[PDB]
Ligand binder design. Structure first.
Ligand SMILES: Cc1nn(-c2ccnc(Nc3ccc4c(c3)c(Cl)c(C)n4C)n2)cc1CN1CC(O)C1
Length: 259
């Protein structure tokens, strides 16, 4: 959990940047072989979110969730994770048109299995999007970025407190469930089959909220398998209670994939 800083080496250069700061390729020395890692460096509000983020990742063990090596307190605080070489799913699918829909069907199904696991563990992601999926190989996808994630209380199915990936009940009533993540996964799927395209192009959050309360949804992407588009619309059920959970979505994706 707490790593030695002399057994970790970084690059000078980063991979990307947000508000938290930089993400960097690095090399952690293990019992005897080195392992290639992605390290989230921090440029005490922000410090506390990181230790929370690592806390979520600590309790999660699934092949489709990014794996955490540990935390390193040195210089700046550092979250050290298993490296997923190909990186984000959107910038990739942007830069790789040739990727056949069967590949994308496989890739988003791995996510749904990942999210199914998360639902069963009663954790809410609250940030599920193409950008926050990473690729180990072209046929191995993992869910990343648990910075906004929450462990649900044993006695409730929602946390009470990015608008384009958010379920309507998240906007109006501030409630975040696995069902609201199912909505996000809907948008994630749209992005995937649109090859990394931004959802609701050139619309402000309130225009998106307007459209949805009219019972309108995003149009089917160019060349998207038809059954997969029906799934996006079911994922985007306005009513929380008739919207499917992740087991239900994972089932369809599996069934249609071997078809
Ligand atoms: C919390 C976190 N973990 N993590 C990460 C973990 C394991 N491997 C990798 N490998 C990896 C590999 C390549 C990457 C990137 C990341 C990024 Cl970021 C970019 C822009 N490229 C090109 N990255 C990346 C993040 C932050 N980003 C929010 C999403 O856009 C990803």
């Amino acid at each position: 959990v707490y790593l030695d800083r002399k057994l970790l080496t970084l690059e000078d250069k980063e991979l990307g940047s947000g508000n938290f700061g930089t993400v960097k390729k690095g090399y952690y020395q293990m019992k005897k072989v080195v392992k290639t890692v992605a390290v989230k460096i921090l440029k005490p509000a922000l410090k506390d979110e990181l230790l929370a983020e690592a806390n979520v990742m600590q309790q999660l063990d699934n092949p489709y969730i990014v794996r955490m090596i540990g935390i390193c307190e040195a210089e700046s605080w550092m979250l050290v994770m298993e490296m997923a070489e190909l990186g984000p799913l959107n910038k990739y699918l942007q830069q790789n048109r040739h990727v056949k829909d069967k590949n994308i069907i496989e890739l988003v199904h791995q996510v749904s299995m990942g999210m199914k696991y998360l639902e069963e563990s009663n954790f809410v992601h609250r940030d599920l999007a193409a950008r926050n999926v990473l690729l180990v190989t072209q046929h191995y996808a993992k869910i990343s970025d648990f910075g906004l994630s929450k462990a649900l209380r044993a006695d409730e199915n929602y946390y009470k407190a990015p608008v384009k990936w958010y379920a309507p009940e998240c906007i109006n009533y501030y409630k975040f469930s696995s069902k609201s993540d199912v909505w996000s996964f809907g948008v994630l799927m749209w992005e995937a089959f649109s090859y990394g395209q931004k959802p609701y192009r050139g619309m402000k959050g309130s225009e998106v909220t307007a459209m949805l309360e009219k019972g309108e949804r995003m149009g089917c992407p160019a060349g998207c398998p038809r059954e997969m588009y029906d799934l996006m619309n079911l994922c985007w059920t306005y009513d929380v209670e008739n919207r499917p959970g992740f087991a239900a979505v994972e089932l369809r994706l599996r069934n249609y994939y071997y078809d």
